[PDB]
Assembly symmetry: C2
Homo-oligomer: 598 residues x 2
Amino acid sequence: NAMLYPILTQSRMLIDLSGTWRFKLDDGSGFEKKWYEKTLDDAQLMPVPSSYNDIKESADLRDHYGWVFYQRDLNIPAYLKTQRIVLRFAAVTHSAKVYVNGTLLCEHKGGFLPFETEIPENLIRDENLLTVAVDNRIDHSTLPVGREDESNVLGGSFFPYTPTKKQNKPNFDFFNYCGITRPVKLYTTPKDAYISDITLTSSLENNTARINYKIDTKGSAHTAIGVYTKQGVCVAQTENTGTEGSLTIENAVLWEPLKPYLYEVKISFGEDRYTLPYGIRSVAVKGNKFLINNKPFYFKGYGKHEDTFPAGRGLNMPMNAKDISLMKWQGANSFRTSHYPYSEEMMRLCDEEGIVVIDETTAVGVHLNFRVNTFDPIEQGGIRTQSHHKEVIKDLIARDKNHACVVMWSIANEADTGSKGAYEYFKPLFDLARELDPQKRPCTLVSLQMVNYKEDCTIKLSDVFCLNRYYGWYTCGADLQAAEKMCREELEFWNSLGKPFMYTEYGADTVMGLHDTTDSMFTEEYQVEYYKTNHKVTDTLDCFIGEQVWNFADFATSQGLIRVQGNKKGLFTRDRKPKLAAHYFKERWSKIPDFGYK
Amino acid sequence: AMLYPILTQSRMLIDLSGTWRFKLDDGSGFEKKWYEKTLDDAQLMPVPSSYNDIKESADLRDHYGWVFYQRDLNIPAYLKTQRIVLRFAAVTHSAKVYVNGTLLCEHKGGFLPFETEIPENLIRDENLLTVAVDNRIDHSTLPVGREDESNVLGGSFFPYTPTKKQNKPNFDFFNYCGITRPVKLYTTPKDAYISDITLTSSLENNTARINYKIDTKGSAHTAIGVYTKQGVCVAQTENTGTEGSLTIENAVLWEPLKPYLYEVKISFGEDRYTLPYGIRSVAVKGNKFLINNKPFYFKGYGKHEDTFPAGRGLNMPMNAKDISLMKWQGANSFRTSHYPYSEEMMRLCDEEGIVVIDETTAVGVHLNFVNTFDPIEQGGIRTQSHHKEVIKDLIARDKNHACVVMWSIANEADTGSKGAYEYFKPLFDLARELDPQKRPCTLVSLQMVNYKEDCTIKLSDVFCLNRYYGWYTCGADLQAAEKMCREELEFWNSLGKPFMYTEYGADTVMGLHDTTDSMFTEEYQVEYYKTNHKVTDTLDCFIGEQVWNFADFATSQGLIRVQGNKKGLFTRDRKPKLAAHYFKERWSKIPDFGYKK
Ligand SMILES: [Cl-]
Ligand SMILES: [Cl-]
Ligand SMILES: [Cl-]
Ligand SMILES: [Cl-]
């Protein structure tokens, strides 16, 4: 469960295994024939990390159903066996079986969070094969959810037809990109005593900044901790200390949105050494305010995706940096990890750059009615995701708990939260997130637009109400006067509750290069008018504390009659070029402060 | 004299536009006298239209020489009781007109109207109307064609021999030719009719005095009446002869974006004619351009008559669309770059309140981009005689338009070289002599290193500059563009006279973008304009900004023309680029009057 990010230290090797791997589609016999026991025969080559779906020009590969096998040689020095040897998979989408030579080492469910396994030293021969089988299938038990008998609401035909081949049935908009999404690395620690986890929280009372620490270890040794400024000056340290304690940081500089400050927290245990960057800041909800460092924050930003061409969902470090640069150019301060945890490289970069993050689980598609009710008992056909949903919350918080940039947990996106049984499904998950987060950050779920919005169970659970609303697109299309009236009528209800609420999605599909002076859907001008109309309302509501558009950039989806080669609601194109509305938001957000707007 | 043809109680108006026969000359059309018979083995061509883009043939688009248009003309013999006139609104560039194999008239100049009576004796029971159209340009035509001069914009890295002889435009825009504007038959009474109407106005308190001169043929009595739009008579004089005056109490003035047109009704014998007319004053005083005694700020564009697929051909829906976009954007004006526009556009601008800088066909008068203005014997440009005719004909056609506030004598001539003043002084004198309203005159100044030697300084009432700081110089260095802009424009500002941009812009392909200054992107177009306005907004003699161009338009081919000229604020199908929205915002905040008071 504990998943410190692997780094190169005085006690820890870090060997990236990314590169060109062998790759073979399963044909139904890959496990029966034990393909993992030998070199893959008649295979292709595929880059790792990457989604596999768009690398070639093959629809059969893009739309593959089931398993694929990745493989590479693993020839390492025998002297590594004096250390503990760990194989870390930052993400394999969706499920994985990992073999070293003929031996199954581990299995994992969940396509967007890391997992690891020690390699038993007896298994390491002079020459080794590493094989990773990757399953892309989704159903009522996976997060994200795949449909079983439910029909395609975004990709329905006018006339029914029989598909040529069995395929996944996503219950979510974004394309089902699968493969070895994030890096695979070998790392080492000392065998006999090592650090397994580090937990840090901040206390800011009485004009004193302190870091509280909890160091989890294996074995028996002495612990030491020191806190260092950017320039390397030690500002607090203690040796031969307890597993838990606190350190006062004199002259403490707080981490602020768009003004980051990261200390370096250096820990030793026996011969083991680990350094964690850490920003000191407070988060609290009070009344209708979202307080960061006791100041009333206004979210400006986006729902994003991890989506670039041609790697799909795969880690793209140059584009992560481009994206943050574009956010700062635009005057944004924040985004949400729609609809799955993002790479650690992104999260660590957001800590370094001062970008605020709403950290969301993989729980999209928990909705069987967009007659069996979504949250009926499993034995009568209800959704089967709650058990895995708990595991995802535990794993997400364990991975991201120390990030200053994370200010809120989003428990799910667009679940059936207006139906009976939703509160019962979600109450244990909100309780779990609050129990497990050492910083006790706000929790929310992101609310689907619904006719009976007053029955949304978010009202009984969340610290901030996070709304996805499309007044002027999925309703009132090309009637922005009606959109404004409908928007005002519902958002005045949310404002009357006196709690913080915000948009986490709002937007209009826009094909770059389509134009009209006169309100016309899909044009760049309509996208601007759509947003102007919505802001006419939100700017008058004192409890509305944030605007995150759908979406930062155009991204790939499943095929159908309302998806013009993917989702076109980006302010930017897929290659990160600004539409008219991106210039509109640069002007608007330049005039809105991060603090004190409302 | 060229009154716009209208339907009246004394005048039929019969449009001959439609589908005509069309044949490329193969070098034998005059020898074999194709005009004497139905054209054989011919194509079909819409009239009015340029012919170049209607088909899919490069040999047609890039044709050199003559083409023949033809239609049947079967008219009632009872029209022979009337005077019968064939009006060609525009045939580009030169025309020979035949009825039944008799040559009736010829015309040089592709953008102004001409007409001929049809002699009664020539009209048979069945008739053929044939129009031969010449597209060739050289040192004697306006616009100018190159002869031995090099292709600057469309030059190759390595010389080559062209497959076929072709025109060598000394101008950017594509050489669209054909029967550009409508052909109509009209009638007037035979014995006595109105040939021309001239109106000037004077504002004494709230009373307008309209001075008229009605030119006629034959002996009859002349009468004039001025009516409000709703039809109330506000002044009337009978048996007035040729010249006279009359007064309108509490006259409604024509204003930019607030038009008002009276109807001036004239009778002469049995002839009847109605002219729309707006009352307004124009004067340059100090560094001010005064419309109705108020300091105007021009906001607008150089345009082209350019749409797909008609090329230069009259497109009345697009004319109305274009004016609507101008009002949407907050513009108040444009220049007819680089030729007189259709009467239909000019009359629509009167109706809609759009101010016009009316420009001649004189683009390309420049042999050194042998001196341009050397004597013709020594190889100088051979255009001055036709240039005089164009000025005469343009002012004769457009003199009564309230929307026309200034004449542009030429665009981007070689005005910094020796002999330029000697070439242009007679033309400026001519324009001032012939315009009854004595409106301001200018020439449109090419960008040049020796700008203080531009003879515009000695001739023009307003200095009209084409400047590309940040495009043709300082490209992708807008800080240097701002410094170079300020250095030159402070010189012009020091002369104390009104000056303006008539061209400034940056090629921009819709859909190309970059946050970081990059030529041809939509963002760079905006930054280019922001940089220039940083300078112009601080200069008190700078009284107007007209971008190049309203919309992308077709040009000759070459390495710097990305399928034509891309400096439009709008695409060729009139869609707004980022900079079109920039100017809508900017012009929304700048008044038409009193911006620089
Ligand atoms: Cl999505
Ligand atoms: Cl959407
Ligand atoms: Cl041009
Ligand atoms: Cl140009």
